[PDB]
Amino acid sequence: ETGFKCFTCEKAADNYECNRWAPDIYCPRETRYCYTQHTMEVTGNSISVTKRCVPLEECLSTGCRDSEHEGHKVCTSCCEGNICNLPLPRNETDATFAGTLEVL
């Protein structure tokens, strides 16, 4: 891999909007991981998506939590790897800090 790069977006409506308009640029210096936060209805529909290049300290609170807003949950993940944060986390299992199966 060359450098560090993530899908990035601030408060996009869904994964399509986030990824389709994500700039093809490298991460800011002193970031190493790709972060994703997905606010969704518990029934499934996306409400908001934020994706960022981050340091380690932003990746220590992953999982799906209940929102103060009734009927919403917030799922947060992080990953290591070039543009690794293409998907969205939707459940506790995938709302985690992990690598990918690109290279077995």
Ligand X SMILES: *[C@@H]1O[C@H](CO)[C@@H](O)[C@H](O)[C@H]1NC(C)=O
Interface with ligand X by CB under 6 A: which residues? 43-44, 90-91
Of 53 and 89, the one with the shorter C-beta distance to ligand X is: 89
Q: How far is the CB of 96 from ligand X (least distance, A)?
A: 14
Q: Do residues 46 and 38 make contact, with C-beta atoms less than 8 angstroms apart?
A: yes
For tokens 């543009």, the residue is 83
Of 85 and 89, the one with the shorter C-beta distance to ligand X is: 89
- Ramachandran category for residue 11: left, alpha or beta (phi over 0 → left; psi -120 to 50 → alpha): left
Of 6 and 64, the one with the shorter C-beta distance to ligand X is: 64
Nearest residue to the partner ligand X, using Cβ = 44
**What's the helix, strand, coil split of the chain in %, to 5?**
10, 35, 55
Q: How far is the CB of 28 from ligand X (least distance, A)?
A: 32
